[PDB]
Design a protein around this ligand. Structure first.
Ligand code: NAG
Length: 246
């Protein structure tokens, strides 16, 4: 398990949490020095438990699929909640079985569906450590519309930060003040599967992507990533989705 406490949190303690979260994900192989997530994991070992504490010390436990860093569901006191999708229903066979009741959320966990349920795009939702504190608080008591926005914050401040050093840094900058994600942040989230696949295909292709990946840079400029010498590959991405899952 990994834990993060918002009470007394700062950039250093958040970085320790993102480090812990990366390190809790199993891998047998690095590609271009980036850990390659596993094709699959059988049984309960598929799911990592993240214990998150709001400023007041109230807690939820979030279930994360270690093959893809997808959030499946969470437990808040005696109630479990799971996205409405086959992978989360499967997770519900393994985690939080001691909950007194299980609520299936009225949406799947993908960004498209969550944004529809929240009523706004990611572009308009501030993120940061204060927003994460709020998100944990929101998830403590069921409200499916509020929860969608809380989950958009939670996924970006945990999973997306684990995947990209740039996103981790973006949250550290927002330790005491929320701000909507940069366009670069959104671009990276949307491109993780594609980047992961191209970095793997580059092995066997002399470091060259079979298909270029388009990203937005820090200046708001659209750029083509065509090979493993790019800063995105050498100094940003921290985990690779296995091509067996793409
Ligand atoms: C590889 O990527 C870098 C950008 O980091 C670029 O300057 C270079 O032209 C690219 N080379 C090939 C062969 O794609």
């Amino acid at each position: 398990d990994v834990s993060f406490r918002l009470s007394g949190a700062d950039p250093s303690s958040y970085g320790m949490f993102i480090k812990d979260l990366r390190n809790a994900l199993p891998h047998t192989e690095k590609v271009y020095n980036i850990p390659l997530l596993l094709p699959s994991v059988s049984g309960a070992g598929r799911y990592l438990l993240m214990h998150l504490f709001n400023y007041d010390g109230n807690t939820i436990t979030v279930a994360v699929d270690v093959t893809n860093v997808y959030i499946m569901g969470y437990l808040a006191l005696t109630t479990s909640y799971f996205f409405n999708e086959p992978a989360a229903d499967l997770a519900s066979q393994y985690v939080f079985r001691s909950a007194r009741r299980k609520i299936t959320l009225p949406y799947s966990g993908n960004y498209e569906r969550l944004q529809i349920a929240a009523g706004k795009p990611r572009e308009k939702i501030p993120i940061g450590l204060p927003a994460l504190d709020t998100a944990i608080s929101t998830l403590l008591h069921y409200d499916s519309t509020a929860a969608a926005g809380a989950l958009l914050v939670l996924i970006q401040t945990t999973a997306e930060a684990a995947r990209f050093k740039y996103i981790e840094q973006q949250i550290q900058e927002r330790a005491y003040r929320d701000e909507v994600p940069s366009s670069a942040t959104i671009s990276l989230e949307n491109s993780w599967s594609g980047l992961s696949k191209q970095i793997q295909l580059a092995q066997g292709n002399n470091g060259v992507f079979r298909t270029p990946t388009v990203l937005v840079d820090s200046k708001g400029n659209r750029v083509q990533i065509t090979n493993v010498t790019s800063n995105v590959v050498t100094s940003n991405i921290q985990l690779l989705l296995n091509t067996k899952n793409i």
